[PDB]
Design a binder for this molecule. Structure first.
Ligand SMILES: NC(=O)C1=CN([C@@H]2O[C@H](COP(=O)(O)OP(=O)(O)OC[C@H]3O[C@@H](n4cnc5c(N)ncnc54)[C@H](OP(=O)(O)O)[C@@H]3O)[C@@H](O)[C@H]2O)C=CC1
Ligand SMILES: NC(=O)C1=CN([C@@H]2O[C@H](COP(=O)(O)OP(=O)(O)OC[C@H]3O[C@@H](n4cnc5c(N)ncnc54)[C@H](OP(=O)(O)O)[C@@H]3O)[C@@H](O)[C@H]2O)C=CC1
Lengths: 300, 297
């Protein structure tokens, strides 16, 4: 009956993506059985990691870390400690326990930095040029994890996801903030006015569920030692997404000016991930935007 | 004349750089180091610069690969967080000049022979925690160039040769033992690992010259290999040392085969930016290390 089951441990289960992954694994038919977390742990504290795996994971997805760019600029050392030294502490704890399975490190499409429009769509052979300490720490942790795969013989995979859309996303993202505010307009809690910065840029978006499905297909099919973009391959203009949110919400609003963005356009290539795994995006942008508006209605 | 601050002056490369700068009339005046400091201790860094540097060469760190394997965390602390502490100390002092970070050709990792010579557009694949820490510090320094607007340069030097090199390095060890054989202090027998590999070697003086040229003419935000572009078989260099010493040597195996058999780097980018070329032949370098080892014994 069903799948040959494998034990999966996920760090960061309490964060934005983690909560969606736990729900995904509870509802879907998958070979991955999510291991329980025996107690709270801190990646900065090796003694808190010791007994996390009464049953040994066959695979690990490492989501946990300091994920806010302004916080990384505020305290770069702490972001490096959490994202790089924390990853090292996790790797060493897994090693001491006897782990030798699949380790999928979750990086970010932000490692690429400034990319010329002529180099679009971004592919994994483009040399990255991180522009903030968070992106620096992600690229450094990528290298570390892949070095561990070389040194220890583990199956190490790296994913570079681009823009995510989902309930629970950081309010500092313009699309998440726009949805929150529009849901407040629906309920008469704020005027039909949106104060924006530069929204005449395009970015590559995926629903969080398509991002999750890419990670699980990487666990099933990815090549040891390889880096994969996780992206839609489609540019969306921020302004058109805001207009579609208003349309879905049955609201009319004015967008009012609250410095131009450095990177005007971002399109990623997911050819490598699709060729290796069969993965394809399945959630439409309209469904993604409706989902975040609906989530906000029950919270505002 | 511009003020230059160098970390790691007490190390192998830094001692040669201090000597070089005292000898030649370069555009750089080496700043004094007012007190002993520790890159892991931000409070030791604040008063390091009574006069503000115009340029910095960052040599200091944990340079030994077996030590990095022994304690990866410590090597990442020294090489990455130590670099951050230096960047933050300079920023707080008001520095906004040129920062040259010294990385390593070891960041590249495994490279197919058909892909030689190694150029800077090859994606690096570090294979040990030292190389990881160097690649990570490169990205940190270049990110600081972007965000702070400083002129940040990275050099990826390949194998170095010279007096005062770490004794665990194969050529340095061979030269020391052959110098002892010449004096009769050891039997004419040499225990070696896999010496059937080739590496790209430069005399430390040529490496230093490349760094000084980069300070003056490197392009902000760019990475430069610092290498000879010629492969040297370890077995041949050992034979050359014995020939210079006039020692009849016997090489004995100890026993695993090296992962990378051949390494050759391209200095094309460095040369086109700075006109630099190696000036010291491999034989002249080996004479010098042998002759230094002779006085030592
Ligand atoms: N969200 C996005 O838009 C994108 C995300 N990513 C990457 O995806 C991954 C998931 O992001 P997201 O879900 O939004 O992240 P969140 O910030 O929402 O969640 C971070 C998680 O890490 C945990 N964590 C933080 N510090 C530590 C620590 N020192 N020890 C142990 N656990 C710790 C947090 O637990 P607690 O709250 O208890 O501290 C939390 O569960 C990250 O690697 C991120 O960089 C990259 C591209 C896009
Ligand atoms: N030597 C070689 O063959 C190669 C070297 N390189 C790179 O070139 C640079 C110079 O190498 P090399 O001269 O051989 O290095 P050494 O190991 O000989 O010298 C290291 C220097 O760093 C200083 N240092 C170490 N830790 C700290 C710390 N926590 N705070 C302050 N200073 C510290 C040491 O001072 P102290 O003695 O007091 O600890 C010393 O001056 C390094 O970045 C190295 O990676 C590149 C490739 C090959």
């Amino acid at each position: 009956q069903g799948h040959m089951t494998q034990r999966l441990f996920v760090t960061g289960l309490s964060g934005f993506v983690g909560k969606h992954l736990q729900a995904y694994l509870a509802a879907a038919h998958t070979p991955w059985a999510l291991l329980p977390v025996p107690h709270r742990y801190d990646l900065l504290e090796p003694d808190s990691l010791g007994d996390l795996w009464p049953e040994l994971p066959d695979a690990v997805i490492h989501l946990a870390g300091q994920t806010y760019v302004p916080e990384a600029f505020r305290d770069p050392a702490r972001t490096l400690q959490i994202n790089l030294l924390g990853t090292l502490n996790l790797l060493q704890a897994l090693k001491a326990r006897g782990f030798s399975g699949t380790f999928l490190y979750i990086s970010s499409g932000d490692v690429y930095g400034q990319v010329a429009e002529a180099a679009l769509p971004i592919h994994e052979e483009l040399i990255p040029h991180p522009r903030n300490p968070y992106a620096v720490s992600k690229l450094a942790a990528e290298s570390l994890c892949l070095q561990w795969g070389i040194t220890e013989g583990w199956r190490v995979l790296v994913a570079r996801p681009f823009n995510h859309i989902g309930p629970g996303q950081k309010d500092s993202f313009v699309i998440a903030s726009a949805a929150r505010q529009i849901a407040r307009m629906k309920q008469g809690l704020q005027a039909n006015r949106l104060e924006v910065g530069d929204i005449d840029v395009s970015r590559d978006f995926l629903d969080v569920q398509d991002v999750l499905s890419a990670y699980l297909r990487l666990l099933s099919h990815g090549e040891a030692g390889a880096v994969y973009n996780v992206c839609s391959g489609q540019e969306q203009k921020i302004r058109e997404l805001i207009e579609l949110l208003a349309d879905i919400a049955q609201v009319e609003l004015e967008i009012v000016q609250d410095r131009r963005a450095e990177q005007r356009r971002v399109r990623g290539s997911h050819a490598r991930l699709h060729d290796a795994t069969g993965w394809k995006p399945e959630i439409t942008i309209k469904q993604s935007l409706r989902a975040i508006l609906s989530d906000w209605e029950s919270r505002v």
